[PDB]
Amino acid sequence: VQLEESGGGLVQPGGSLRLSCAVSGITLDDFGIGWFRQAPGKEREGVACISPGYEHIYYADSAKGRFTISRDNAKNTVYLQMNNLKPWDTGVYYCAADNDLPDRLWGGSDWSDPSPYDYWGQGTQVTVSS
């Protein structure tokens, strides 16, 4: 049961990055995925989420239009396309998997709360200079 992020690193302001998690031992047909960001001293704050029900693709207001989450279920890998990146996105971007997506959405939980998730990746370091 393994989530390995990749594709982070340095990028100048306005630049773009596409992160990727290779989900393993779990399948994207049963698990929703949240991409999270942890910046220095902040707490884990959700950036985007995709549940298996296909009509559940959500974005945090910060990245509502710049980022795009998607999956290639054939490769059981999820993607996070980040456009027009700014230093305030600097952080470690982690990938999380939760078998209770979308079920909990309809029962009082928020997609961006990171506690309900079940498995966490290792984090790929993202940095937008300056």
Place this chain on the structure above:
Amino acid sequence: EKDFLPLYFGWFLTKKSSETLRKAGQVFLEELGNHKAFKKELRHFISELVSYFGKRPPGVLHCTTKFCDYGKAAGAEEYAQQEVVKRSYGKAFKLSISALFVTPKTAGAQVVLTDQELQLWPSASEGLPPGSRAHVTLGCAADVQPVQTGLDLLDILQQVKGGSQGEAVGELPRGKLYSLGKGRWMLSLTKKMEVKAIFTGYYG
């Protein structure tokens, strides 16, 4: 015990009741999308309503009390160790439906809890009487997650209590329709809708 907890607790409406409420919901949208008082205020609703709220719950309607994430949610264990919770489990209830609301984000129903039902209840975090968030989600905009419904209902109640209730703009058959502004609509029922439900846990 903590580890045996449900994903969450709630009043899950019965099939007959769930369908009654599902029906009544779509009529409010059919009648709201065609109410002239609404067609003028579409600039503050958007840049057919049943389709707009195309993300609907896939089973029976329910009124959530406590999200638990299998004991690992905040306060999950404490809610479960309440004598009212472990005793009313599997017992049947009669909820009152107060009004039906429509924002540019979510569409839902408001629940008024009896003092006994309120024993099961665990920004908008301030000013309003307990259980004010109690609802039943009926639809969501494509990009909106359902937990939004509870906060719009609170947003409306902070308005009606605020005084910005705004006089009646439309007469529907089941009650009077009000417009609180930023694309928010409310149907206060002439006769409250009593809906049957069971108090229990949701698993998987």
